Design a protein around this nucleic acid. Structure first.
Lengths: 232, 123, 92, 159, 416
RNA sequence: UAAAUACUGAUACAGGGCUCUUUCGGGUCUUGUAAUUGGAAUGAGUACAAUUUAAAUCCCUUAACGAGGAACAAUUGGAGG
RNA sequence: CUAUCAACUUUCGACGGCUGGGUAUUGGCCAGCCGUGGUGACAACGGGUAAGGGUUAGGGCUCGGAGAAGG
């Protein structure tokens, strides 16, 4: 039940939606790194007008998020969730811009079929099996045995299996998803360890601005290989 | 930077500024004129009523308490169509911006006047 | 009685045609939005019963009047997708 | 004092004003403008504050039509006066454009909604008409001097 | 020096404010989503043979013909006797038109009601490109509009307050822009025969108006030296103030009025001013893009035998001659053609530059058509026929009467 | 904060009106009247509607009425005959 | 803020370490065993009660203990 100004500055609200703002329900993505489905439908896309209209869209099986039907209105969809609407025949993708806000991208089924997800941790689960945890809280059982931490994975999204992976690399272009230099698509050119907590990388854009961002806030997107269509 | 921004648009930048047709910026049968700042807000209220076309409440008691108190603490005044700003801190920025923005032919004549004996004497 | 439709939006998931309507009565009194529902049947090839009009503020000095019009694909789609107060104002 | 009484009576008579509150209102806004001009004359020439703020003040007064387009110095902005402001009022502009026979006729017309400034009719006689908007003062279309219905006493007589 | 110091400080502030292959834009991509949720340029300035133009310089029983419109088979003349004559033009595979019908102003029925039609002589005429509406406005304070075929008046708008001076159609639409002599311009929706909106803002009387395919106008007013570009839906304007600046030096006159206007495409237009200035104006710029001076030269100095009544005529005193200003000015839409006619006896044609940021001369067209060129109308055969309307005096007033010249429609075409 | 309680003519008749330093004195020249008549303009109010809105109201549109003093009724103080 | 506050803690253990208990877990948090501590003129301790942070042209905007008649 937070106010419209206490809502974060990256899912935008104008002077229109009242003094209050919806809170995202608990789910895969975080609270402050989130776009709820009602803000995506009626405050960003404007396929709806009111809360009851958004409910009348959501309750019938017309909005699918990451390939599954998401019914509740304030479902969290933070980063790179393909959002398939079949009556309009569109699939939107959530990326950022250079200023630090949410951006929507229209696309069809060929790029809508896969999800590029960053690995959070690799472990040995119960049954003596290695399993893999992404930032979408997707756990994949029996992964490829080189996919370590901070590697990204092309998730199939019709079975959910691994298809390809991109390694953490000095020389692979990356996207920033946090910090004071948030949302700046550039190339990882250096990486400093700082063992004892909070190591960094040094990263430059396409046009020569060096800056240091933390290896938590980084997010690998591809060496050149823009596997998701960043908007031209 | 308020007085400085209007100097560029009208004297420096070679681009014509949209002027309203004369009777359009009159509020309530003449009771006020809409200044170019207050007019630009009024389109922003209107340009939000065709996007998803839900109507608005024409202000409320809690916004009118705020914006009419803004006149109480400001030295602005609107004598005509224009605004007349006070000469306080808005004048000091004009000085404060401009300080960071500022941060062998001779010898021949001598031998050509040393050759001829002399022209004449004192008349 | 002169009509123009700006910003016509399809909206298939809510199944309703969204029009910003600028109507003009010069010299007449106001437009009687039930008769405007009757007028927005042959302009967009629909029944009168599946049209709902709201907004509808008259501009200063007569003439122009801005309304917002929604035409549903069926009266039952209107019945299951309309608010109660707009349904009462329409008469269903 | 008799000087203040005779001065305010000359203003109220020469421009058809209602009381001395309108005179004191104009004298207050004139003193505000003139105080801003004196404060800008306090600074030396070619200070950027004086340059841009005085250019803003002079362009504002020339655009609202009080200060003449010939003289554009801050000394003439100091030499401004309340007769120039009351001349820029709407009621004296109707009297000088000749839609009305006297200034009290002009106040009567503006009160009962005959003239219009540009597009919209103007109900207030103290409307500060700008220089660009001075030309578009005319009778409205709903007025019997403009057109439409022949009017009220005309209707009662023609019945 | 204070002005140049302000210019220096402002340019420094511009440099400070000024002080990306993967750059994105949330609000601009949102405007893209909303827009996705919701007039060819020609260059025929060299493809015509102006020296090989074929002309019919004829005339008929009239006082002085004022204006013409081009319905594509037809023509529509207005004459100060009070006639509007609908005429049929010619085709090549006989060089004078055959008049088919006319309508006369009846001033006897000014008192008599339900008479749509003029009381006094009309001044301008325009024809809709459909061919079903023809509109004409005069100094009788009213603008009438009717059917093109039977030429019988169906509507007589009385909304203007002084006189109707300029009149223009939106191309491809029946939206009308009529600019008047009470410094206003009223836009009409002629499909329902109704007035939709008025537009104020002009300082002096409005002399000309031009329109194109969009819902815009460009209107020139006379002695304020101002062309105003008109955004009709949002009701806004853009001001363009001229202030125009071996021969005698006193003969160089500044821009007195701004008589004629012609929109050549969406982004720029051209204005003709009675000191003989022809100025190309761009909407992106606040200044003239390119002004050319004395576009029809100076007048001849008047004779001593009329200027002084003396037994000796001495040329020691004679005033400096003034430039013959543009009386008519037209263009083809989305072309490079600037037709300008003064009372020099010749009808000049200009063109654009290859960068379209300059005006250039291509020469005199009739290589005379004497009189005062009141009007120009253009038509394409498929190779263009232009009619030029000339009389003994100007359009709106009998200021300069000329015993030379004829009350003639002069029809000439360029076949290449 | 904005501003209603009136605007504008014609005719008839009276010969005085006003001022001051200097006062049984000087200065200036059109002013009146509870006179007779004529024009228009109309917003306060009354008000069919439609619209606004959860339902109403206000606002914006708006057909029809709506001015001669004895009224659609200006007040608060001070000085004097 | 104050030395008209220079000693304070061990006066509900004051500082450890060992062992357990209890806690969702660490921990003198609590219980048994012993060791001698701990802070302080670089301002402890005591006393007075008058209980801001972030967003940076600016102002604005945002966030901020005890009781349900008495133990």
């Amino acid at each position: 039940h937070q106010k419209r100004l206490s809502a974060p500055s990256h899912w935008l609200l104008d002077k229109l939606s009242g003094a209050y703002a919806p809170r995202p329900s608990t789910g895969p993505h975080k609270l402050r790194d989130c776009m709820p489905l009602i803000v995506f439908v009626r405050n960003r896309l404007k396929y709806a007008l009111n809360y009851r209209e958004t409910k009348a869209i959501m309750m019938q099986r017309l909005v699918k998020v990451d390939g599954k039907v998401r019914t509740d209105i304030t479902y969290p969809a933070g980063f790179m969730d393909v959002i398939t609407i079949e009556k309009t025949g569109e699939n939107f993708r959530l990326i950022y811009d250079t200023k630090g806000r949410f951006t929507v991208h229209r696309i069809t089924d060929e790029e809508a079929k896969y999800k590029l997800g960053k690995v959070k941790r690799v472990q040995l689960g119960r049954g003596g099996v290695p399993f893999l945890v992404t930032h979408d809280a997707r756990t994949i059982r029996y992964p490829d045995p080189l996919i370590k931490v901070n590697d990204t994975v092309k998730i199939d999204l019709e079975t959910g299996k691994i298809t390809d992976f991109i390694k953490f690399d000095t020389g692979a272009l990356a996207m920033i998803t946090g910090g004071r230099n948030m949302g700046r698509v550039g190339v990882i050119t250096h990486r400093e360890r700082h063992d004892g907590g909070f190591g960094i990388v040094h990263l430059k854009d396409a046009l020569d601005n060096t800056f240091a961002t933390r290896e938590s806030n980084v997010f690998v997107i591809g060496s050149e290989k823009p596997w998701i269509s960043l908007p031209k | 930077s308020a007085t400085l921004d209007e100097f560029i648009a009208d004297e420096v930048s070679t681009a014509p500024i949209a002027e309203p047709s004369i009777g359009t910026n009159i509020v309530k049968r003449g009771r006020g004129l809409k200044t170019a700042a207050e007019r630009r807000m009024e389109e922003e209220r209107r340009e939000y009523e065709e996007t998803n076309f839900v109507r608005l409440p024409k202000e409320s008691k809690k916004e009118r308490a705020k914006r009419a108190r803004m006149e109480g603490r400001s030295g602005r005044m609107n004598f005509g169509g224009e605004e007349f700003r006070e000469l306080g801190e808005g004048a000091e920025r004009i000085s404060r911006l401009t300080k960071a923005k500022s941060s062998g032919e001779r010898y021949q004549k001598r031998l050509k006047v040393l050759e001829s004996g002399r022209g004449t004497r004192g008349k | 009685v002169t009509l123009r439709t700006r910003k016509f939006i399809r909206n298939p998931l809510l199944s309703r045609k969204q029009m910003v309507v600028d109507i003009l009565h010069p010299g007449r009194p106001n437009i009687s939005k039930d008769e405007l529902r009757e007028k927005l049947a042959t302009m967009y090839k629909a029944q009168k019963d599946q049209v709902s009009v709201f907004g509808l503020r008259t501009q200063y000095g007569g003439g122009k009047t801005t309304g917002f019009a929604l035409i549903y694909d069926s009266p039952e789609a209107l019945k299951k997708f309309e608010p109660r107060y707009r349904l009462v104002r329409a008469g269903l | 004092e008799a000087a203040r009484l005779d001065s305010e009576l000359k203003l109220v008579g020469e421009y058809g004003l209602r009381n001395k509150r309108e005179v004191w209102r104009v004298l207050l806004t004139l003193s505000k403008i003139r105080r801003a001009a004196r404060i800008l004359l306090t600074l030396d020439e070619k200070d950027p504050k004086r340059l841009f703020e005085g250019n803003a003040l002079i362009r504002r007064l020339v655009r609202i039509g009080v200060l003449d387009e010939s003289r554009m110095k801050l000394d003439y902005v100091l030499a401004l006066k309340a007769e120039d402001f009351l001349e820029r009022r709407l009621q004296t502009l109707v009297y000088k454009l000749g839609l009305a026979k006297s200034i009290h006729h002009a106040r009567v017309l503006i009160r009962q909604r005959h003239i219009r400034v540009g597009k919209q009719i103007v109900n207030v006689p103290s409307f500060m008409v700008r220089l660009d908007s001075q030309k578009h003062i005319d009778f409205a279309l709903t007025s019997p001097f403009g057109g439409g219905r022949p009017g009220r006493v005309r209707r009662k007589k023609a019945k | 020096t204070a002005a140049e110091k302000r210019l220096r400080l402002a340019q420094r502030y511009l440099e400070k404010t000024r002080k990306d292959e993967y750059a994105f834009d949330a609000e601009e991509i949102d405007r893209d989503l909303l827009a996705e949720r919701l007039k060819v340029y020609r260059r025929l300035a060299s493809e015509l043979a102006f020296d090989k133009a074929t002309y019919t310089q004829f005339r008929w029983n009239s006082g002085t013909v004022t204006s013409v419109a081009v319905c594509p088979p037809y023509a529509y003349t207005t004459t100060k006797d009070g006639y509007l004559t609908k005429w049929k033009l010619q085709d090549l595979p006989k060089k004078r038109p055959e008049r088919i019908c006319f309508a006369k102003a009846d001033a006897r029925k000014a008192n008599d009601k339900t008479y749509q039609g003029h009381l006094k002589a009309p001044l301008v005429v325009k024809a809709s490109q459909d061919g079903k509406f023809v509109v004409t406005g005069g100094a009788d304070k009213r603008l009438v509009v009717y059917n093109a075929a039977d030429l019988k008046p169906i509507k007589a708008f009385t909304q203007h307050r002084d006189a109707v001076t300029g009149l223009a159609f939106r191309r491809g639409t029946n939206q009308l822009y009529s600019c008047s002599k009470d410094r206003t311009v009223k836009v009409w929706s002629l499909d329902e025969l109704a007035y939709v909106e008025t537009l104020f803002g002009h300082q002096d009387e409005i002399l000309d108006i031009d329109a194109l395919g969009q819902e815009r106008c460009v209107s020139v007013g006379a002695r304020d030296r101002t062309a105003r570009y008109w955004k009709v839906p949002e009701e806004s304007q853009l001001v363009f103030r001229g202030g125009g600046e071996g021969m005698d030096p006193a003969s160089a006159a500044h821009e007195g009025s701004m008589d004629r206007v012609a929109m050549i495409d969406d982004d720029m237009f051209v204005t003709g001013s009675d000191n003989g200035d022809l100025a190309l104006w761009s909407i992106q710029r606040k200044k003239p893009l390119h002004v050319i001076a004395r576009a029809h030269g100076l007048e001849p100095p008047i004779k001593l035998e009329d200027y002084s009544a003396d037994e000796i005529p001495d040329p020691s005193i004679i005033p400096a001659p003034q430039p013959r200003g543009i009386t008519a000015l037209r263009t083809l839409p989305y072309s490079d053609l600037i037709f300008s006619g003064s009372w020099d006896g010749c009808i000049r044609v200009w063109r654009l530059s290859e960068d379209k940021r300059k005006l250039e001369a291509v020469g005199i067209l009739g290589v005379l058509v004497r009189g005062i060129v009141n009007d120009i109308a253009l038509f394409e055969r498929g190779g263009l026929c232009v009619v030029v309307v000339t009389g003994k005096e100007m359009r709106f007033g009998r200021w300069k009467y000329m015993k030379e010249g004829r009350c003639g429609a002069v029809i000439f075409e360029v076949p290449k």
